[PDB]
């Protein structure tokens, strides 16, 4: 008590000198300037000032300011393209190492990986990777082998090629001594009327762990192209094609492309047409469209925050006072909310005779809200849709609400796949974990950014995903000393049943080619 009173003024006085020494340099910069003063106006309706103390009442003419065109009300929101969910072991790489089992060395990976979106501690799916989804001498060198006996089985001359620090057969001695879908899981039990999918009236997806030929899995479609009429069971089930199943239409072909042969997967790829912002013709901000759009053509994914129904109930309190609700029912259990985070299309105003409509389609387990054109739309119409069913002009920028003049309004498209704040926000969420070591943390940060930069959305893509990761980010792998954790990432990819075995050999080969250089 007597101690803290004494620290206040010793810091006050040291802080005081900081005030003095700083304020002088501002004062010294003030002696540098010879700035003119303010003088009265005799050049030019009139303003007047009286004094409550006996003094002549002073009058001067009133110089009028030119009118300035105001803009409608807008509150602070954040760019988004893929939805956002909200709530209502030593390092084995560098100087200090340890020898632990197969599961302890990989523990953070199996629990922190997301089987559906391919990132560590993702932002959509809160439930961790279900149990059987991830089952298909120093201390560091020995704990590595311990990981491989579950993965590499009995191959001895190949295991030595990985660890690099020892050789072949000597290894012997170690051997001697409408509801939302979530993946269903139940060993020794078929997917019967006790299965969460059956109970929820959802088909098991590729992520489920039920039998291969389970009687509840959606099979995909066999269409040659389009997938856009009732004939295609993907379309007919209000689904976008599953790009690890529908190999015939094109959902698994040319993932780089945006106009694919299959037209019922424009949401998952993000082939959304260009949107432009301007004041609405009703009142407030409205959205207009750049180029023309056909009848029943995809416009944009109505995107936002994923909130619970109980969180949607508390926010419905605050939203009611401004006569302006921006939330839509995604399914029975979850609601999307564009008030805090959203995308360009959240500026479609309500109208009961609209030219667009909302269809709540399904994409790889995730229910998403798609906006489609009710009729044909030509250049420069404002897009409307009916809020009830789901719940030669001046153009403006999206991020800043500044005027976007026509000089460069063609390839602007202020809507990428990985925004600047997410690329950082995922780094915030990796480091904050207190139970995960920081050697494994500094690799999952590298993977999450690599995934978002290209936009991976298919299980079949993961061979190219892990081979492209080495070509670009493998340099940061060696410079930051994570070559061993990268191998853990590979056998975790291989534990989750979505990478080829020869790629793990091919990936380490391309890392060692630059390592020994």
């Amino acid at each position: 008590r007597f101690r803290r009173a004494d620290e206040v003024k010793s810091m006050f006085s040291s802080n005081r000198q900081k005030i003095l020494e700083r304020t002088e340099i501002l004062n010294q910069e003030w002696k540098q300037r010879r700035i003119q003063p303010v003088h009265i106006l005799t050049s030019v309706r009139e303003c007047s000032v009286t004094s409550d103390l006996d003094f002549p009442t002073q009058v001067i003419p009133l110089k009028t300011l030119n009118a300035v065109a105001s803009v409608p009300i807008m509150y602070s929101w954040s760019p988004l393209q893929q939805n956002f969910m909200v709530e209502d072991t030593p390092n084995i790489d560098g100087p200090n190492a340890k020898s632990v089992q197969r599961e302890q060395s990989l523990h953070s990976f199996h629990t922190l990986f997301c089987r559906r979106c391919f990132k560590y501690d993702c932002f959509l799916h809160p439930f961790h990777a279900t149990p059987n989804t991830y089952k298909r001498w120093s201390g560091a060198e020995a704990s590595m082998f311990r990981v491989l006996i579950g993965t590499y089985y009995d191959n001895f001359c190949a295991i030595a090629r990985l660890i690099g620090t020892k050789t072949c057969r000597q290894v012997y001695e170690f051997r001697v001594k409408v509801y939302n879908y979530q993946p269903c899981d139940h060993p020794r039990q078929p997917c019967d009327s006790s299965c969460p999918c059956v109970i929820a009236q959802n088909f098991c997806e590729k992520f489920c762990q039920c039998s291969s030929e389970c009687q509840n899995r959606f099979p995909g479609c066999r269409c040659k192209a389009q997938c856009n009429t009732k004939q295609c069971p993907c379309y007919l089930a209000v689904r976008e094609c599953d790009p690890d199943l529908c190999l015939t239409c094109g959902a698994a072909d040319h993932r780089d492309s945006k106009n694919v042969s299959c037209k019922n997967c424009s949401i998952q790829r993000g082939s959304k047409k260009h949107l432009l912002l301007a004041p609405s013709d009703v009142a407030g901000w409205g959205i207009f469209i750049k180029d023309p759009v056909q009848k029943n053509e995809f416009i944009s994914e109505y995107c936002g925050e994923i909130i619970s129904q109980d969180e949607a109930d508390r926010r419905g309190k605050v939203y009611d006072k401004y006569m302006c609700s921006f939330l839509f029912n995604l399914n029975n259990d979850f609601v999307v909310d564009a008030t805090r985070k959203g995308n360009k299309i959240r500026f479609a105003n309500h109208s009961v005779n609209p030219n667009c409509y909302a269809k709540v389609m399904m994409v790889n387990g995730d229910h998403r809200i798609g906006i489609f054109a009710k009729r044909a739309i030509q250049t420069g119409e404002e897009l409307f849709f009916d809020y009830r069913y789901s719940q030669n002009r001046l153009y403006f920028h999206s991020d800043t609400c500044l005027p976007l003049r026509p000089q460069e309004m063609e390839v602007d498209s202020e809507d990428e796949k990985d925004p600047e704040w997410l690329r950082e926000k995922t780094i915030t969420q990796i480091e904050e974990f207190s139970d995960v070591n920081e050697g494994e943390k500094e690799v999952m940060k590298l993977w999450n950014l690599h995934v978002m930069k290209h936009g991976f959305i298919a299980d079949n893509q993961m061979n190219h995903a892990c081979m492209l990761f080495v070509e670009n980010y493998g340099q940061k792998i060696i410079k930051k000393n994570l070559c061993r954790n990268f191998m853990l990432h590979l056998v975790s990819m291989h534990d989750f049943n979505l990478i080829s075995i020869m790629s793990i050999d091919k990936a380490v080969t391309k890392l060692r080619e630059m390592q020994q250089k």
Partner: protein
């Protein structure tokens, strides 16, 4: 320590929510302040024997605008003063009192604007604190929006005040979300924006100038005050900020000995260094101010007591007068810290002199 010598009143009887002395005054040149309120900015000069002289006045085209604040600034190469004003419409006019015309105007804030400040070492960088939950850093010289402070981790409610630090290296803001958020501006990422915002040219590149959205503060806390916060000014490396709790509070973030230029974002501890206790001041939007050498601290209340404080408590001296009746929104000293002008709710002004 002071003494009142004059009182004024305008011709609209509407409240005035701020005043500033143009601290960019020359040496040996007369003291000048400016008054915002209603839809009109009025400028004033001081003279001998408590005379307050009326210089010029500007009215905006529509009576719906309700100005809230203003701040002075000199031009780099033309030497004229400029007084930027912003209010309910969210527009920031410049209005130089030399040629007496709205030289520039910047639309595009999401709501009203609640406080304005300028960078201490650059008279071209203007910060606006807005009702739209975000701070914005303009650039008077080159017509470019540099930054937008407030995205995902920004101010989740309405923002009401901010202030640069002394050298000009770290902004601190606060608003109706009970939070005070430090946004440094000395990082090379914010700096290469200020650099490239000058070397930007509208007809030199078909590409709008890349404005920097800052989504994550460099420090945040809600541990100081309880209810909303409506004012905040730096103290070098300490921070003063008030609330509707009848007390201005001093605090530094982090531990005691942890330097402010080394506190990294995820810091959660504070250190309340004490409070200036006052009475009857407890409504929306009631700022204070400090003189140029930061030994004075002046606050007004709703019934006309015009508090003062000695900042070298290494002394609740008060100022009251028989006609000083309505509320006191804002005060501002002169640069030489000799004259204290306070504005009121009933469109009145009071002039106090030190001895």
């Amino acid at each position: 320590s002071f003494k009142c010598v004059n009182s004024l009143k305008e011709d609209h009887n509407q409240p005035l929510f701020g005043v500033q002395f143009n601290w960019h005054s020359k040496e040996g040149d007369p003291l000048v302040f400016a008054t915002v309120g209603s839809n009109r900015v009025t400028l004033y000069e001081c003279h001998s024997q408590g005379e307050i002289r009326l210089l010029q006045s500007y009215v905006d085209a529509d009576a719906d605008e309700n100005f809230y604040t203003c701040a002075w600034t000199y031009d780099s190469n033309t030497s004229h003063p400029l007084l930027a004003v912003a209010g309910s419409r969210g527009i920031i006019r410049i209005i130089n009192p030399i040629t007496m015309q709205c030289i520039k105007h910047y639309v595009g804030h999401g709501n009203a604007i609640n406080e304005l400040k300028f960078h201490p070492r650059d008279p071209n960088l203007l910060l606006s604190v807005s009702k739209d939950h975000a701070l914005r850093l303009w650039n008077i010289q080159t017509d470019t929006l540099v930054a937008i402070f407030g995205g995902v981790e920004g101010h989740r409610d309405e923002v009401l005040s901010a202030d640069y630090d002394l050298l000009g290296e770290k902004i601190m803001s606060c608003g109706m979300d009970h939070s005070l958020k430090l946004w440094r501006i000395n990082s090379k990422r914010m700096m290469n924006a200020i650099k490239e915002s000058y070397d930007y040219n509208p007809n030199k590149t078909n590409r709008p100038f890349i404005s920097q959205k800052i989504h994550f503060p460099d420090f945040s806390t809600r541990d100081i005050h309880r209810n909303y916060v409506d004012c905040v000014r730096w103290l070098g490396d300490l921070i003063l900020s008030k609330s509707c709790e009848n007390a201005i509070v001093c605090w530094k973030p982090g531990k005691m000995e942890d330097d402010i230029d080394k506190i990294k974002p995820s810091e959660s501890n504070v250190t309340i260094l004490g409070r200036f206790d006052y009475s009857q001041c407890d409504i929306w939007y009631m700022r204070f101010s400090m003189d140029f050498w930061q030994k004075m601290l002046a606050l007004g209340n709703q019934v006309g007591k015009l508090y003062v404080w000695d900042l070298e408590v290494e002394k609740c001296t008060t100022l009251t007068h028989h006609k000083c009746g309505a509320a006191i929104r804002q005060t501002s000293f002169s640069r030489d810290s000799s004259i204290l002008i306070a504005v009121c709710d009933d469109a009145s002004i009071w002039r106090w002199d030190r001895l």
